Amino acid sequence: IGMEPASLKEDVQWHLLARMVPFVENNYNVCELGPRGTGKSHIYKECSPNSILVSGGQTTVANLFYNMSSRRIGLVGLWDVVAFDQVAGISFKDKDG
DNA sequence: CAGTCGATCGATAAAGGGGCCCTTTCTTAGTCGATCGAATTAAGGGCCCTTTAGTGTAGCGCG
Numbered sequence A: 001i002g003m004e005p006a007s008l009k010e011d012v013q014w015h016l017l018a019r020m021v022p023f024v025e026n027n028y029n030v031c032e033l034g035p036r037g038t039g040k041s042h043i044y045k046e047c048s049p050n051s052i053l054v055s056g057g058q059t060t061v062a063n064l065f066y067n068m069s070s071r072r073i074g075l076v077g078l079w080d081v082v083a084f085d086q087v088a089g090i091s092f093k094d095k096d097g
Numbered sequence B: 001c002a003g004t005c006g007a008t009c010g011a012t013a014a015a016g017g018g019g020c021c022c023t024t025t026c027t028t029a030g031t032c033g034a035t036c037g038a039a040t041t042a043a044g045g046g047c048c049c050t051t052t053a054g055t056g057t058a059g060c061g062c063g
Helices: A010-024 A042-046
Strands: A051-054 A079-082
Touching: A042 A051, A042 A079
Parallel strands: A051 A079
Antiparallel strands: none
């Protein structure tokens, strides 16, 4: 990832492995909260071409799950990891979202 | 070969979704804001509390 293992504790290394865990298990849900500047969102954006960082969180249901107008699947059918940044403000216009 | 394609390129009404108004309640406090309670202020004002005069009695000047 670009991290120095010798400068990190074993527990922090295991937390970093738990960061990669979503990439390796099908349909793996996980939530992480931390102080700003702890490098949470680095891996989901820069360290893999198989993950997406849906910024803001205000992404629509048709975009994310399924758009009947085009009958084409949303994000979850395409990327192996979908990471919602700034979970505080994430909101769906449609109530069923 | 010239007849005459089946893909193409125009429309002109659909359900879904984006969006962006947008208005519209809907609160949310900012300032009323005139009211009303209660609590000051006083000024008034009715009112209870003192002196005087006139009646029955003991001392004392006196014809």
